[PDB]
Amino acid sequence: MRILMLGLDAAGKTTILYKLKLGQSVYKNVKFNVWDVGGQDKIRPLWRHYYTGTQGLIFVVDCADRDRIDEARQELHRIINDREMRDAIILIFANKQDLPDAMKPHEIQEKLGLTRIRDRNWYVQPSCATSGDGLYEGLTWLTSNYK
Ligand SMILES: Nc1nc2c(ncn2[C@@H]2O[C@H](COP(=O)(O)OP(=O)(O)O)[C@@H](O)[C@H]2O)c(=O)[nH]1
Ligand SMILES: [Cl-]
Numbered sequence: 001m002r003i004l005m006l007g008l009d010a011a012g013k014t015t016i017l018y019k020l021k022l023g024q025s026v027y028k029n030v031k032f033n034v035w036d037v038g039g040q041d042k043i044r045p046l047w048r049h050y051y052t053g054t055q056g057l058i059f060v061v062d063c064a065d066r067d068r069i070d071e072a073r074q075e076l077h078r079i080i081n082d083r084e085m086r087d088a089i090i091l092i093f094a095n096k097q098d099l100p101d102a103m104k105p106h107e108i109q110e111k112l113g114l115t116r117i118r119d120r121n122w123y124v125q126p127s128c129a130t131s132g133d134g135l136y137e138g139l140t141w142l143t144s145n146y147k
């Protein structure tokens with residue numbers, strides 16, 4: 001399965017990738033690409049990325065970062081609307097659930113406008129990337145929904 005992992009900078013993408021790696025004993029067919037979106041995107045606004053071949057999207061959100069949730073919402077909807085992304089299965093990692101007063105998954109659903117995503121499979125997984133909680137649960141949802 002070809003999975004794209006996106007999120008604003010500091011969402012926890014690097015941490016999830018190293019923690020998922022640490023969980024493997026000492027998902028063989030999963031391929032991952034990863035980059036930052038939003039104001040700290042290396043390419044926007046002068047060029048677009050290309051999303052060819054993407055089967056699954058993992059969108060990582062810092063749930064304690066209310067100041068940037070609107071920017072995360074705008075990036076998510078812009079990406080999923082690209083021609084090459086119209087069939088992509090969407091996993092949202094609602095990251096940093098360990099932090100006091102972090103936004104819970106139902107608030108994430110509302111703040112990301114997920115209810116307006118029709119004719120496409122999506123799921124919100126609560127996670128704490130530093131402890132590894134919810135990471136395999138999210139990756140299992142994504143890969144099982146792909147089959
Ligand atoms: N409290 C807490 N910190 C996290 C969690 N996930 C990542 N971090 C921290 O948030 C910061 C940015 O994470 P990083 O993985 O580098 O984000 P990236 O820019 O999206 O790759 C780092 O200091 C991570 O330790 C989490 O679940 N809880
Ligand atoms: Cl783009």
Ligand SMILES: [Cl-]
Binds near residue numbers: 048
């Ligand atoms: Cl454009």
